[PDB]
């Protein structure tokens, strides 16, 4: 399962 | 950053006329990611080619595989044609069955 | 042995041609197992390995929703970076991320990682400690400071040590017949003439899994790594890999050169000659 990325 | 693609064409099994095989065009070490990759049989585009194995290396360059099932014959010729911004014109690499 | 779960993420803008292209590709070890591509007709997370048939429909729905959210986050990120780098809205740019974890034979965490790049250059990365970040330039330093105040490293560490490890173990269990197999290389040598009374000898290794392999050429017992030409190990379309390595030797002296192949599926390494 993949990650929910944080905005840059 | 601009990096020109390395284009490699090869079969899964040593080619034997009349025996089912898989033909591969591995396009690697390129950037930017926009690219067009076509597999050709006797100069004509092969339909339904599968794209797989997209990844990138430690230097961020892109890698991707085009592959298709095929049964070699003595007269059929195969190639892979690639268009990428690092190249003014398209580059074609031929399957060399004796490599 | 050890095993990994990795996700390769790419977002590429295309001004004048609509929304960015967004893709996620997942691997267990060397085996592609899931993919999301925004340019598909009906974008959804899809299985890429047969064993992923063992997940139920909820898995696919949840991963699809996550991917769609990620796609929107990266679309914003492309715009944000134009600001950080003072770039125009007319040029194409790329964000890349590699995220994942590795476990030992016992299923316990060995390492976790997350690294970002912008236009093919390092941007920000998680350090090995899983607690701090390293930023390659001043733009990434802005991101670092945002992530520190949002408690992002704690969140990421929780994913790496928890979800990532737990799902990797599950994928290895479900996909054991594929992922824990060994397919032994089959090797052969080809020969090609050259000008100047020399010959190219090419040693091929075919049909193997996993991907790690060593090919060398020897003369009088010493390896010829300096004089060798080779290709990076490459996928062959059916979940196996191939490689070749070549040397140029004098005509008539081919019999003195030997190719050696070392692999998990070769209890004794192979030794071949033309
Ligand atoms: C792979 O493992 C299975 C056991 O795992 C179960 O079936 C898998 C396909 C997967 O769905 C897992 O999550 C399941 O937990 C092995 O199958 C068995 O092995 C033992 C020993 O021979 C036997 O007693 C059981 O009856 C088998 N179970 C079933 C359902 O057939 C299988 O041998 C493994 N495959 C290989 C080639 O290693
Ligand atoms: C941003 O680019 C503009 C030109 O488009 C330039 O005039 C300006 O100096 C740049 N701003 C900064 C602070 O770098």
CATH code of the domain covering residue C127 = 3.30.500.10
Q: Based on the structure, what is the number of domains in chain C?
A: 2
Q: What is the C-alpha to C-alpha distance for residues B79 and B94, in angstroms, rounded to an integer?
A: 4
Q: What ranges make up the beta strands (E) of B17-90?
A: 21-30, 36-41, 44-45, 50-56, 62-70, 78-83
Give me the residue from C26, C69, C77 closest to A4, CB to CB.
Answer: C69
Q: What is the C-alpha to C-alpha distance for residues B92 and C9, in angstroms, rounded to an integer?
A: 28
DSSP character at residue B36: E
Angle at C159 between CA C153 and CA C165, to 5 degrees: 135
Q: Dig out the tokens for B53 from the structure.
A: 């194995």
Q: What is the C-alpha to C-alpha distance for residues C171 and C219, in angstroms, rounded to an integer?
A: 44
Residue range of the domain that includes C210:
182-274
Q: Give the architecture (CATH level 2) of B1-99.
A: Sandwich (2.60)
Domain extent listing, chain B: 1-99
Residues C103 and C68 in one domain: yes
Question: By CB neighbour count within 10 A (0-12 exposed, 13-18 middle, 19+ buried), where does C230 fall?
Answer: middle
Residues C167 and C210 in one domain: no
Determine the distance in angstroms separating the CA of C182 from the nearest CA of chain A, rounded to an integer.
25
Q: Dig out the tokens for C16 from the structure.
A: 């004048």
CATH of the domain at C190: 2.60.40.10
Scored b (16 or more CB within 10 A) or e, B9-33 reads bbbbeebeeeeebbbbbbbbbbbbb
Residues C172 and C227 in one domain: no
Last residue of a domain, one of C152, C181, C210: C181
**How many CA atoms within 13 Å lie on the side-chain side of B84?**
23
Residues C108 and C140 in one domain: yes
Last residue of a domain, one of C181, C205, C230: C181
Q: Among C128, C98, C124, which Cα is nearest to C111's? A: C128
For chain A, how far is it from start to end, CA to CA, in angstroms?
22
Task: Give the list of residues 6+ apart from residue B1 with CB closer than 8 angstroms, or none.
Answer: B31, B60, C119, C120, C121
Residues C255 and C173 in one domain: no
Residue closest by Cα to atom 37 of ligand 1: C177
* Residue B33 DSSP SS3: coil
Chain B touched by C184 (CB under 8 Å): no
Determine the distance in angstroms separating the CA of B95 from the nearest CA of chain C, rounded to an integer.
14
Chain B touched by C32 (CB under 8 Å): yes
213-232 in chain C: CB under 8 A from chain B: 231-232
Residues C80 and C121 in one domain: yes
Please give the helix or strand (H or E) that residue C51 lies within, else none: none
Say if the Cβ atoms of C155 and A5 lie within 8 Å: no
Q: Among C91, C6, C8, which Cα is nearest to B63's? A: C8
Ligand nearest to the CA of C171: 1
Bridge partners, B8 (sequence order): B26
Q: Specify the experimental method.
A: X-ray
Taking the centre of ligand 2 as the mean of its atom positions, its distance from the CA of residue B75, in whole angstroms, is 60
Say if the Cβ atoms of C164 and A5 lie within 8 Å: no
Pairing of strands C31-37, B91-94: unpaired
Ligand nearest to the CA of C83: 2
Taking the centre of ligand 1 as the mean of its atom positions, its distance from the CA of residue C185, in whole angstroms, is 26
Chains that touch B (3 or more CB pairs under 8 A): C
Cα distances (Å, whole numbers) of residue C146 to B27, C74, C118, C150: 37, 16, 17, 6
Size of interface B-C (CB pairs under 8 A): 80
Q: Where are the alpha helices (DSSP H) in chain B?
A: none
* Sign of the torsion angle spanned by Cα atoms C124, B57, C169, C53: positive
* Residue B87 · residue B2 · CB < 8 Å: no
Residues C26 and C135 in one domain: yes
Q: Where are the alpha helices (DSSP H) in C125-244?
A: 138-149, 152-158, 165-174, 176-179
* Sign of the torsion angle spanned by Cα atoms C106, C52, C62, B57: positive
Angle at C257 between CA C251 and CA C259, to 5 degrees: 130
């Amino acid at each position: 399962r993949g990650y929910v990325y944080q905005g840059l | 950053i601009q990096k020109t693609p390395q284009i490699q064409v090869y079969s899964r099994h040593p080619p034997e006329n009349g025996k089912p095989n898989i033909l591969n065009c591995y396009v690697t070490q390129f950037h930017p990611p926009h690219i067009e990759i076509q597999m050709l049989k006797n100069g004509k585009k092969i339909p339904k080619v599968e794209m797989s194995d997209m990844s990138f290396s430690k230097d961020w360059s892109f890698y991707i595989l085009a592959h298709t099932e095929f049964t070699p014959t003595e007269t059929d010729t195969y190639a892979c044609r690639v268009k990428h911004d690092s190249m003014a014109e398209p580059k074609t690499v031929y399957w060399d069955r004796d490599m | 042995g050890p095993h990994s779960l990795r996700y390769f993420v790419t977002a590429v803008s295309r001004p004048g041609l609509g929304e960015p292209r967004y893709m996620e590709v997942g691997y267990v070890d060397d085996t592609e197992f899931v993919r999301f591509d925004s340019d598909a007709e009906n974008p959804r997370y899809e299985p890429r390995a047969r064993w992923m048939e063992q997940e139920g429909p909820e898995y696919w729905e949840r991963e699809t929703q996550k991917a769609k959210g990620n796609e929107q986050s990266f679309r914003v990120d492309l715009r944000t970076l134009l600001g950080y780098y003072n770039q125009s809205k007319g040029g194409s740019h790329t964000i890349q991320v590699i995220s994942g974890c590795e476990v030992g034979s016992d299923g316990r965490l060995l390492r976790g990682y997350q690294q970002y790049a912008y236009d093919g250059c390092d941007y920000i990365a998680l350090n090995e400690d899983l607690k701090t970040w390293t930023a390659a330039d001043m733009a990434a330093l802005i991101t670092k400071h945002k992530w520190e105040q949002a408690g992002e490293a704690e969140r990421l560490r929780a994913y790496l040590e928890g979800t990532c490890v737990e799902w990797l173990r599950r994928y290895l269990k479900n996909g054991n017949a594929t992922l824990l197999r060994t397919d032994s290389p089959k090797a052969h040598v080809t020969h090609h003439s050259r000008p100047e009374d020399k010959v190219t000898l090419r040693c091929w290794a075919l049909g193997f899994y996993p991907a790690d392999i060593t090919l060398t050429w020897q003369l009088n017992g010493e390896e010829l790594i300096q004089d060798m030409e080779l290709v990076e190990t490459r996928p062959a379309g059916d979940g196996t890999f191939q490689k070749w390595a070549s040397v140029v030797v004098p005509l008539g002296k081919e019999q003195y050169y030997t190719c050696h192949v070392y692999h998990q599926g070769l209890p004794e390494p192979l030794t071949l000659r033309w």
